[PDB]
């Protein structure tokens, strides 16, 4: 029974982590039986969720991605905890290349074959007038040849503030916490020498925590903490900020999120006039020799270079070009705006960009909740709901089979992106 079951959430200061803790409380677990451990206090300074904003949009990449995105959309609008941080201003995919414009038309078409009425909220913008109508800040000369796929369920998310909302709720309820060395996972604990029964974890300062179940929601660090047998390859993405005056930023107030697969995106300025800009690229790895728990020998493993641990870090020289390229493409009027708060942000890719949410195959009681594949912040309100379903063996098979333990199911280095990710060692500029 839930009221006497103890759960440990490793990486609980992050996205999937905090979500799991939230839905444990909502399910009826006793708050004092739930322990959140993270290297950083919630909201974790190093979770990929620690950002001014993230994009919300509907992805049809998989069978349950569609179901999950709509589920998340519902909560972002109607859940009292989350709905303050959803800005439902819409999201527009654009392209002016032949190859790219056809990608849009195929995406629109598969949304219709979902047969769940997505045509009511997704539209192909076939002319420049239709684009300028949704995003008046563009000039017509800037967008000639552009077509757009507009999603009315889209918009952006106050990412850090949202996780923080969960965290403060967890604390009011009485969830237990472990931060710093007292919260940094090192290894699982077992009752038996055969390590078939996990009964807790031990952190790096030596602290041992005991629970009935352990959830590993450590994002890009999961593949480094325990042997995931190359299922998850951690990669970095980049962003930068520019500052606008109240006059300049007024033209972008409540404007839709604009994305082009060949350039990146930007999100409307926040209350301080700050615009976040991203490029799009297959990501950056950081391979090192490491020996995650359960691996018999040290392997080559992409290990996150945490901006939180190294604040003087920025990103490779190459990324500076593509980010500015994106700025020129979308916001040419701000090309002389100096960039600041450059930083790398880490995700972990699976081969098929599906999550890795399953019980460990040998360590009974140890559960994996990661494989976010760099598309999963939008799932903050509802992913924890399905992790709990897994813990209780009530997980709908569509999710269960898609999220199953699956080593040898593809090359996660390339995943579903344009190319295998390049490594930080071959991309100078980020260390200072
Ligand atoms: C990097 C990035 C990601 C991203 C994005 C843009 C960038 C630049 N834009 C997104 C977007 O527009 N829309 C979207 O839906 N997602 C976007 N993302 C990715 C999204 O953030 C991630 O997919 C999502 O955050 C999933 O993360 P989850 O797996 O929870 O991972 P996390 O938030 O980083 O959490 C990791 C927590 O791990 C804790 N940790 C790490 N190591 C330990 C150890 N050793 N022990 C205990 N805890 C550990 C960290 O505290 C961290 O909080
Ligand atoms: O999937 C989305 O809703 C937008 S995520 C945008 C992005 O920058 O986020 C970081 C990585 O996921 C990249 O793959 C990706 O291009």
Author numbering: 3 to 434
Question: What's written in the study?
Answer:
AnFPOX-15, which featured 11 amino acid replacements in AnFPOX-1 exhibited significant F-VH oxidation activity, whereas reactivity for longer fructosyl peptides such as fructosyl tripeptide (F-3P, Fru-VHL), fructosyl tetrapeptide (F-4P, Fru-VHLT) and F-6P was never observed.
To assess structural differences between AnFPOX-15 and AnFPOX-21, for which the largest improvement of F-6P oxidation activity was observed, the obtained X-ray crystal data were structurally analysed. The crystal belonged to P65, and it contained two enzymes arranged in an asymmetric unit. Although all amino acid residues from P3 to N434 were identified in one molecule, but S61, G62, and A63 in the other molecule were omitted from the final coordinate file because of the poor electron-density map. No significant structural difference was noted between AnFPOX-15 and AnFPOX-21 (rmsd = 0.436 Å and 0.441 Å for 431 and 427 Cα atoms, respectively), excluding for the structures in mutated residues, suggesting conservation of the elemental architecture of AnFPOX even after gaining significant F-6P oxidation activity by introducing seven mutations. With respect to AnFPOX-21 the B-factor values of the Cα atom of loop A (S61-N64) was significantly high even in coordinate-determined chain (S61, 94.22 Å3; G62, 84.36 Å3; A63, 94.43 Å3), suggesting structure flexibility of loop A because of the mutations. The surface model of the AnFPOX-21/FSA structure illustrated the opened active site gate even after FSA binding.
